[PDB]
Amino acid sequence: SCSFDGRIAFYRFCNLTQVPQVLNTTERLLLSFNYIRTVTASSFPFLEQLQLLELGSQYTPLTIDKEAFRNLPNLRILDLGSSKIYFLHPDAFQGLFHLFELRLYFCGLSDAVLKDGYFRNLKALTRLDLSKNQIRSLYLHPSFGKLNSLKSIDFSSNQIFLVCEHELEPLQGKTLSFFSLAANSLYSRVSVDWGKCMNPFRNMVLEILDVSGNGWTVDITGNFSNAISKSQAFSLILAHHIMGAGFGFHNIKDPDQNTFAGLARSSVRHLDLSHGFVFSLNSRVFETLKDLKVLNLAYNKINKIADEAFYGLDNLQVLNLSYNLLGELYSSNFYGLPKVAYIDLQKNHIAIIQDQTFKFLEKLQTLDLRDNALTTIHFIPSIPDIFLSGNKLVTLPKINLTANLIHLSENRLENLDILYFLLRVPHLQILILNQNRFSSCSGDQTPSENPSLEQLFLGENMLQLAWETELCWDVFEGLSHLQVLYLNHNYLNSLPPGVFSHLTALRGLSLNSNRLTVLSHNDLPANLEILDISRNQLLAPNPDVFVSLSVLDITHNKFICECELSTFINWLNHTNVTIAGPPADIYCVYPDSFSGVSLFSLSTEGCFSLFIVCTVTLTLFLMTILTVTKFRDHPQGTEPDMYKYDAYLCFSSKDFTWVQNALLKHLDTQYSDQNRFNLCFEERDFVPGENRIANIQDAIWNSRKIVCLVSRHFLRDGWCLEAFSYAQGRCLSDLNSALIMVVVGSLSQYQLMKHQSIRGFVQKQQYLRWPEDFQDVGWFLHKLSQQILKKEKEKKK
């Protein structure tokens, strides 16, 4: 099983009938590599909370009866992969109301025609997949008309030879409906129809159109381009064929001219050539298609790049050149792409990038160069974010203010390319430097000019000898990451106190996997929440302790447990458990006799054992069964009746910003995993079956208390339903702890209409107003967590 109570998997166990042992709350069920064959009615009346029900995977089903999936309303998707169904029953998929996708990969369609298909009662049917089938006719059945949510379909590996006009009637029937027609993928078609009254693709807007391998020869694939004329399609991928680019080159230099002749009239926006194995890319390829807003080239082997190659693209935006470089490069790649913005040159084998490379550009706002090249920045436009990982030594950078994001992982940098790069990016926020193997660290000429520096990781790297200078002297909110910096403790003994002096808004410093001997403590910062210290050789105490410190990781370190240092072992004990890390991962090293004991067990004695270990286990057994009772909200299971909630939160819709961020989060954070402090709502947990006013009525009985949030808006339409209820039937008295008033905002007097119950709970004056200052934020949470846990007043007098 993957997850307890929810996710259960059964990967090949050879069962005959379904598994009943599973619970009814199982949301993700997986039955594959098994056999059931005959699927009779009432198959799964057990589970009713399913979503991911991957049934069909080589389950070799022979037939399918009706009422198979009747008790599966919340059924999201169903994957009938590699199945062999012969008989298809009309009312088999009945009851599936929330069915979106449906994978019918190799369902064994011996009954090719889709007319007999039964996907009419599937309105939420979005992505209906049909691959590895034997469909002969592309003729869309009238049932597609009802399919409004139908967004994508993948017709691949079927058959379909001719594509008449009459086979596209339901298409023109819908005025607004996206359609990712992924047909003609790995087929054996021959010809199609053209002309007629209206072209088969005339007055028809499609989302996506794939033609991954259509014909056998270039001569028969030209007629098809004459039928796709006058068609408004977003994308159009011509993959698995084009081995070379050019004026209009595909295979043979003679019939390759009639191809672009039909796509010239149509205004193509997106053109992709993935897995096309384009060796050479001749001069001027996309010239007829200037309306190409976005292009795509994934997994290729480009080598011929002319200065007139990308010409024609007057308005390009996106362009992913993923794995298609290597084999030298020239100067000025994109000379005709001023409006370019996003480019993805991930995973390549470029040697050395020249100076003038990213010439004639301006609107470039995102440069992703993962494992691209040796990187040489000189004429790189205003790009806010850039990714440069998996590289080597980098040369002088050249960027501007616009750069607010930048990444550098798994590299080999120096103290030059980092200084100048930061000199003009005060808008920088996130920055990463993991496993860069820093060579030399300057005194203060590397991380200069960067006030808004938020994230800054310096893990796995080396410095000039050891840390002995302050680099972060201008970084206020600098969250550093010092993981194994190979720092020699000899120079760390006289560590400059002016390093952790400027840092005032530090969230947490992580000094782990390091190699120090004396753990200095400069508690100048006051916003430090954590300090990870593990895999070290520390053994030195310090009276100076931070104020906001809470979680101090100090596990697995060379601790000397003898009579020499008794002041250090004394500090860690005085710091209570509230200020310490897992005691379980702390053992003494130096001691040969005693090895594997936590510091919170060693005896502080100055330099009969069976009695010692027998008395201490008794003293342990004297307190551990005396403090768990005392130490360990109001238990719902001990309540007289059966209440489901602790407090019903009554509020307004305009004041959701507070009830959703502060109130709920501060009352749910405690005993969250224990699910003890539950809150009743009116929109999160309701009954459609029920009435508005009464929805609150039931919430009163179920909840232990009622904590409303009176406001200048809560009176406008939140009290209009409450006051009316108090008139007829009474429930909440005056001086009872059952009701708790909370004033989030001062409410005037003119707002109060003729309601007599609103001014009744204000007369008693027992509300909990929201403090204005931030220092008072806590005294409110105290009482807000008290009055509710308070025992309700009894009925007797």
Ligand X SMILES: *[C@@H]1O[C@H](CO[C@@H]2O[C@@H](C)[C@@H](O)[C@@H](O)[C@@H]2O)[C@@H](O)[C@H](O)[C@H]1NC(C)=O
Query: Which residues in this chain contact ligand X in the complex, by CB under 6 A?
Result: 13-16, 19, 21, 23-24, 48, 190-191, 219-220, 223, 274, 296, 298, 318, 320, 322, 344, 381, 400, 570, 573-576, 578-579, 600-604
Counting contacts by CB under 8 A, is residue 2 touching a second copy?
A: no
Contact present, 198 and 168 (Cβ < 8 Å): no
Burial of 103 (0-12, 13-18, 19+ CB in 10 A): buried
Residue 235 beta carbon to ligand X: minimum distance, rounded to whole angstroms: 10
Q: Which residue number, 13 or 161, has a Cβ lying nearer to a second copy?
A: 13
Selection from ligand X, a second copy, none that 751 binds (CB < 5 to 8 A by kind) is: none
Interface with a second copy (CB under 8 A), residue total: 22
Q: Which residue number, 252 or 563, has a Cβ lying nearer to a second copy?
A: 252
Q: Using alpha carbons only, give the angle 391, 395, 399 rounded to the nearest 5 degrees.
A: 100
Handedness of CA 589, 594, 595, 597 (dihedral sign): negative
Q: Using alpha carbons only, give the angle 793, 794, 797 rounded to the nearest 5 degrees.
A: 110
Q: Which residue number, 455 or 537, has a Cβ lying nearer to a second copy?
A: 537
Concatenating the DSSP letter of every residue in 427-439 gives T--EEEEES----
Question: What is the C-alpha to C-alpha distance for residues 546 and 507, in angstroms, rounded to an integer?
Answer: 12
Contact present, 680 and 648 (Cβ < 8 Å): yes
Site for a second copy in 161-220 (CB under 8 A): 216
Question: What is the C-alpha to C-alpha distance for residues 372 and 391, in angstroms, rounded to an integer?
Answer: 7
Counting contacts by CB under 8 A, is residue 252 touching a second copy?
A: yes
Question: What is the C-alpha to C-alpha distance for residues 541 and 510, in angstroms, rounded to an integer?
Answer: 18
* Token pair of 760 as six digits: 């009744």
Q: Which residue number, 343 or 647, has a Cβ lying nearer to ligand X?
A: 343
Binding string, residues 552-591; x marks residues near a second copy by CB under 8 A: ----------------------------------------
Closest CA to 525 of 552, 498, 543: 498
Please select the residue that binds a second copy; options are 624, 669, 675, 748, rule is CB under 8 A: 624
Q: Which residue number, 349 or 759, has a Cβ lying nearer to ligand X?
A: 349
* Token pair of 550 as six digits: 């809470």
Mark 562-588 as b/e (b = at least 16 C-beta within 10 Å). eeeeeebbeebeeeeeeebbeeeebbb
Q: Which residue number, 315 or 434, has a Cβ lying nearer to ligand X?
A: 315
User: Residue 568: enclosing H or E segment and its boundaries?
Assistant: helix 568-574
Token pair 């020499």 is found at: 564
Counting contacts by CB under 8 A, is residue 593 touching a second copy?
A: no
Token pair 């003890």 is found at: 676
Residue 573 beta carbon to ligand X: minimum distance, rounded to whole angstroms: 4
Selection from a second copy, ligand X, none that 24 binds (CB < 5 to 8 A by kind) is: ligand X
Residue 721 beta carbon to ligand X: minimum distance, rounded to whole angstroms: 30
Residue 398 beta carbon to ligand X: minimum distance, rounded to whole angstroms: 7
Contact present, 757 and 722 (Cβ < 8 Å): yes
All residues at 6 or more sequence positions from 772 whose CB lies less than 8 Å from its CB, including other chains: none
Give me the phi and psi of 270, to 5 degrees please.
-120, 130
All residues at 6 or more sequence positions from 755 whose CB lies less than 8 Å from its CB, including other chains: 715, 719, 723
Selection from a second copy, ligand X, none that 615 binds (CB < 5 to 8 A by kind) is: a second copy
Handedness of CA 682, 683, 684, 690 (dihedral sign): positive
Residue 227 beta carbon to ligand X: minimum distance, rounded to whole angstroms: 10
Handedness of CA 684, 690, 692, 695 (dihedral sign): negative
Residue 479 beta carbon to ligand X: minimum distance, rounded to whole angstroms: 25
Residue 676 beta carbon to ligand X: minimum distance, rounded to whole angstroms: 20
Q: Which residue number, 351 or 551, has a Cβ lying nearer to a second copy?
A: 351
Taking CB under 8 A as the binding criterion, the range among 72-80, 622-630, 736-744, 778-786 that sits at the site for a second copy is: 622-630
Site for a second copy in 715-754 (CB under 8 A): none
Selection from ligand X, a second copy, none that 149 binds (CB < 5 to 8 A by kind) is: none
Contact present, 506 and 478 (Cβ < 8 Å): yes
Question: What is the C-alpha to C-alpha distance for residues 173 and 150, in angstroms, rounded to an integer?
Answer: 14
Token pair 């009851």 is found at: 95
Residue 423 beta carbon to a second copy: minimum distance, rounded to whole angstroms: 27
Selection from a second copy, ligand X, none that 191 binds (CB < 5 to 8 A by kind) is: ligand X
Counting contacts by CB under 8 A, is residue 620 touching a second copy?
A: yes
Please select the residue that binds a second copy; options are 23, 162, 190, 622, rule is CB under 8 A: 622
Chain centroid offset of residue 527 CA: 29
Contact present, 190 and 220 (Cβ < 8 Å): yes
The alpha helices in 671-711, defined as continuous H runs, are: 692-702
Please select the residue that binds a second copy; options are 23, 423, 597, 616, rule is CB under 8 A: 616
Q: Which residue number, 484 or 602, has a Cβ lying nearer to ligand X?
A: 602
Token pair 């000094």 is found at: 511
Taking CB under 8 A as the binding criterion, the range among 155-163, 166-174, 189-197, 615-623 that sits at the site for a second copy is: 615-623
Taking CB under 8 A as the binding criterion, the range among 17-25, 525-533, 610-618, 757-765 that sits at the site for a second copy is: 610-618
Residue 294 beta carbon to ligand X: minimum distance, rounded to whole angstroms: 6
Q: Identity (one letter) of the amino acid at 725? A: S
Selection from ligand X, a second copy, none that 190 binds (CB < 5 to 8 A by kind) is: ligand X
Selection from ligand X, a second copy, none that 16 binds (CB < 5 to 8 A by kind) is: ligand X
Residue 397 beta carbon to a second copy: minimum distance, rounded to whole angstroms: 21
Residue 633 beta carbon to a second copy: minimum distance, rounded to whole angstroms: 24
Site for a second copy in 474-533 (CB under 8 A): 490
Site for a second copy in 117-156 (CB under 8 A): none
- What percent of the residues of the chain are helix, what percent strand, and what percent coil, each to the nearest 5? 15, 15, 70
Give me the phi and psi of 489, to 5 degrees please.
-55, -15
Please select the residue that binds a second copy; options are 110, 615, 660, 733, rule is CB under 8 A: 615
Residue 618 beta carbon to a second copy: minimum distance, rounded to whole angstroms: 6
Closest CA to 503 of 465, 467, 529: 529
Residue 408 beta carbon to a second copy: minimum distance, rounded to whole angstroms: 21
3 state DSSP class of 166: helix
Residue 14 beta carbon to ligand X: minimum distance, rounded to whole angstroms: 4
Please select the residue that binds a second copy; options are 618, 642, 687, 735, rule is CB under 8 A: 618
**In the chain, after which residues does the backbone break, taking C–N over 2.5 angstroms as a break?**
607, 632
Q: Which residue number, 38 or 604, has a Cβ lying nearer to a second copy?
A: 38
Residue 55 beta carbon to ligand X: minimum distance, rounded to whole angstroms: 16
Please select the residue that binds a second copy; options are 626, 693, 731, 752, rule is CB under 8 A: 626
Selection from ligand X, a second copy, none that 499 binds (CB < 5 to 8 A by kind) is: none
Which CA distances in Å does 571 have to 519, 522, 545, 548, 576? Answer: 13, 16, 10, 17, 9
Selection from a second copy, ligand X, none that 609 binds (CB < 5 to 8 A by kind) is: a second copy
Strands 38-39 and 52-55: unpaired
Selection from a second copy, ligand X, none that 629 binds (CB < 5 to 8 A by kind) is: none
Binding string, residues 336-355; x marks residues near a second copy by CB under 8 A: ---------------x----
The distance in angstroms from the start CA to the end CA of the chain is 56
Taking CB under 8 A as the binding criterion, the range among 188-196, 400-408, 609-617, 754-762 that sits at the site for a second copy is: 609-617
Question: What is the C-alpha to C-alpha distance for residues 1 and 19, in angstroms, rounded to an integer?
Answer: 13
Counting contacts by CB under 8 A, is residue 610 touching a second copy?
A: yes
What does the binding site for a second copy look like in residue numbers (CB under 8 A)? 12, 14, 216, 252, 327, 351, 490, 537, 609-611, 613-618, 620, 622, 624, 626, 628
